[PDB]
């Protein structure tokens, strides 16, 4: 079960919460819930702005320059990818994570009607990629979206746990709720 072992959110969220003024700024800029941002901070770095994963996901929202970093630079009208030092900077890190969430909402996940389903799809896509999420429904992006829209948030989570090739995928939703409950 993707909820084992249990995940206590109180501390990660407490530390995440220290970044709220930045998350508010980033969120307002990109049309993203600052609590959604904070929960992602808590789950991914536990609020450590200097954290670097074994796969080079960097900073508070654990962005990978070669994937999310590139997509955000593209969205800004820029070439290339952000540096590791830029991704360690709290403001630049949160602003880019917020931008990535908006990119996901407006691109691959466009059309998802239920706000809770969309929230869940955003976190799973953020963590394991929109392409991977969509492929658990269809090879056609918008048929995938049509299928997602047949589901409620609980069914959506069930489908992810049942079909997603990465076991961690539904665990991100479990921790998401843990974090939201601590806030
Ligand atoms: C150690 C610690 O402190 N914490 C760790 C924690 O880091 C670990 O989790 C890690 O989290 C990060 C996210 O925060 C994971 O990063 C994910 O990884 C995804 C899979 O590679 C990645 O998905 C890819 O995103 C690309 C860019 O959007 C997609 O390509 C794009 O597709 C578009 C069409 O949909 C296309 O138009 C674009 O042109 C194209 N862009 C580019 C540049 O190619 C790509 O399709 C997609 N992959 C798939 C399969 O769908 C996410 O972007 C990325 N998110 C971010 C925000 O960077 C990271 O992988 C996690 N690590 C691991 C090992 O899983 C965690 C362990 O899980 O442990 C904690 O302790
Ligand atoms: Cl996949």
- Ligand 2 centre to CA of 132 (Å) is 4
**Taking a C-beta distance cutoff of 8 angstroms, is the pair 99, 78 a contact?**
no
Q: Is 64 in the pocket of ligand 1 (CB under 6 A)?
A: yes
Hey, where are the domains in the chain?
A: 1-183
| Residue burial 34-56, b: 16+ Cβ < 10 Å; e: rest | bbbbbbbbbbbbbbebeeeeeee
- In 82-140, alpha helices (H): 84-88, 90-106, 115-128, 130-135
Compute CA 183 distance to the chain's CA centroid, rounded to the nearest angstrom: 17
If you write DSSP's letter for every residue of 6-17 in order, what string do you get?
Answer: ----HHHHHHHH
Q: Which of 104, 175, 98, 154 is nearest to 133 (CA)?
A: 104
* Experimental structure resolution, Å: 1.9
Which CATH architecture does the domain made up of 1-183 adopt?
A: Orthogonal Bundle (1.10)
Of residues 109, 124, 105, 115, the one with CA closest to residue 173: 124
- Ligand 1: residue whose CA is nearest its atom 71: 44
> Is the Cβ–Cβ distance between 18 and 155 less than 8 Å?
no
- Residue 83 CA to residue 94 CA, distance in Å, equals 15
Residue whose CA lies nearest to ligand 1 atom number 30: 67
Q: 91: how many CB neighbours lie within 10 A of its CB?
A: 15
PDB experimental method: X-ray
């Amino acid at each position: 079960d993707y909820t084992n072992p249990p995940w206590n959110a109180k501390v990660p969220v407490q530390r995440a919460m220290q970044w709220m003024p930045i998350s508010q700024k980033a969120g307002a800029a990109w049309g993203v819930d600052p609590q959604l941002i904070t929960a992602i901070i808590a789950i991914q770095s536990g609020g450590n702005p200097n954290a670097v994963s074994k796969s080079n996901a960097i900073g508070l929202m654990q962005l990978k320059a070669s994937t999310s970093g590139r997509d955000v630079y593209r969205r800004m009208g820029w070439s290339g990818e952000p540096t590791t030092s830029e991704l360690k900077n709290p403001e630049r890190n949160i602003s880019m994570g917020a931008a990535y969430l908006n990119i996901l909402e407006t691109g691959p996940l466009a059309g998802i009607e239920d706000p809770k389903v969309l929230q869940y799809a955003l976190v799973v896509s953020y963590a394991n990629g929109a392409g991977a999420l969509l492929r658990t429904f269809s090879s056609d992006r918008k048929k995938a979206i049509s299928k997602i829209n047949d589901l409620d948030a609980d069914e959506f989570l069930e489908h992810v746990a049942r079909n997603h090739p990465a076991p961690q995928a539904p665990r991100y939703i479990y921790k998401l709720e843990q974090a939201l409950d601590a806030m």
